[PDB]
């Protein structure tokens, strides 16, 4: 029989770096958003319903 | 004497005790082709369980696992075997005018105020000390 | 070992559970549990069907443990499961005091002792009182 279809899960690995002289924004300002958006919101008590997008993918 | 003749009530208690003899359930998969009085038969099995069995009910059981499973039911649970549900108290009542006994005894038509039936009459037997 | 006699024949099958129960004022019982094999076909696939068909309701059932008599009663309540490829049957057997339990009788017993009421009352099934 068919019981249930598990939800599609996406795996993805990133890297941040700020000491090369093109990179001037400190990576804590860029990680203060990933740590915030991938956690429970203070308003409602739930995750944030993310949406990942790429230019032609 | 519960009824006029005790043939039917003697057949009826013997039949309601037969239904406790064979009882169980057949878990099928998903059909509305069965009813609580269908009397289906088991044929292709071994010598233990082959024969016609009369159903008692169907259960549908929709859920996420197992899909849809129309469970069949065989047999009836138990029985009290009373002729009528017993009242074992003493009650008081008033005598109700006069009405002759259609059952040709000498029964005196009374009321019972435990019932809220002021219109309907109940024939009752009279107990005397001596009678003879 | 443990030998299940039913109706006088020693009835070679496979018991997966045996439990003999015996209390102080109650009818002693004995649950069996068998397994009817289905996956080994051939001559011994219908010859095991012949051995379970001898288990009619009300038969002499005898259990023997290490060449001593264990239970020795009549059979009641043969349940069979048949889930998937499993096909088990479950037996129960009750003592000779089962003949006394569900039939409403009426007697009077005038001018009798405590024992002569009761040894003549157990005698209707064949139970022999010792007192």
From TrEMBL, chain A:
Name the UniProt record assigns to this protein: Afp7
Span within the parent record: 59 to 115 of 229
Species annotation: Serratia entomophila
TrEMBL record, chain B:
Top-rank lineage group of the source organism: Bacteria
Range of residues in the leader sequence: none
Protein name: Afp8
Organism expressing this protein natively: Serratia entomophila
Annotated gene: afp8
Portion of the parent chain present: 266 to 397 of 529
């Amino acid at each position: 029989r068919y019981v249930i279809s598990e939800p599609v899960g996406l795996n993805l690995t990133l890297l941040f770096d700020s000491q090369m002289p093109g990179n001037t924004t400190p990576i804590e300002t860029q990680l203060a958003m990933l740590k915030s958006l991938c956690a429970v919101d203070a308003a409602t008590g739930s995750p944030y319903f993310l949406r990942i997008t790429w230019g032609k993918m | 004497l519960p009824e006029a003749t005790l043939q039917t009530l003697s057949n009826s208690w013997l039949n309601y005790q037969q239904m406790t003899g064979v009882q169980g359930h057949i878990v099928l998969a998903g059909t509305r082709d069965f009813a609580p009085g269908e009397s289906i038969t088991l044929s292709g099995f071994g010598a233990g369980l082959d024969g016609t069995a009369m159903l008692s009910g169907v259960n549908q059981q929709f859920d996420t696992q197992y899909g849809w499973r129309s469970e069949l039911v065989i047999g009836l649970p138990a029985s009290m075997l009373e002729p009528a549900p017993p009242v074992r108290s003493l009650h008081i009542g008033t005598v109700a005018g006069f009405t002759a006994d259609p059952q040709h005894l000498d029964r005196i038509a009374i009321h019972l105020p435990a019932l809220n039936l002021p219109d309907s009459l109940i024939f009752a037997r009279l107990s005397k000390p001596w009678a003879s | 070992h443990i030998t299940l006699d039913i109706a006088g024949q020693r009835s070679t099958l496979g018991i997966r559970r045996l439990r003999v129960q015996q209390l102080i004022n109650e009818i002693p019982l004995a649950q069996l549990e068998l397994h009817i094999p289905t996956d080994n076909h051939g001559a011994a696939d219908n010859a095991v069907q012949h051995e379970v068909s001898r288990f009619t309701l009300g038969v002499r059932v005898g259990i023997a443990q290490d060449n001593k008599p264990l239970f020795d009663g009549y059979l009641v309540q043969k349940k069979m499961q048949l889930k998937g490829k499993e096909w088990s049957v479950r037996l129960e057997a009750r003592h000779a005091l089962q003949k006394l339990t569900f039939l409403p009788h009426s007697r009077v017993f005038r001018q009798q002792d405590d024992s002569t009421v009761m040894k003549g009352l157990l005698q209707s099934a064949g139970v022999k009182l010792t007192q």
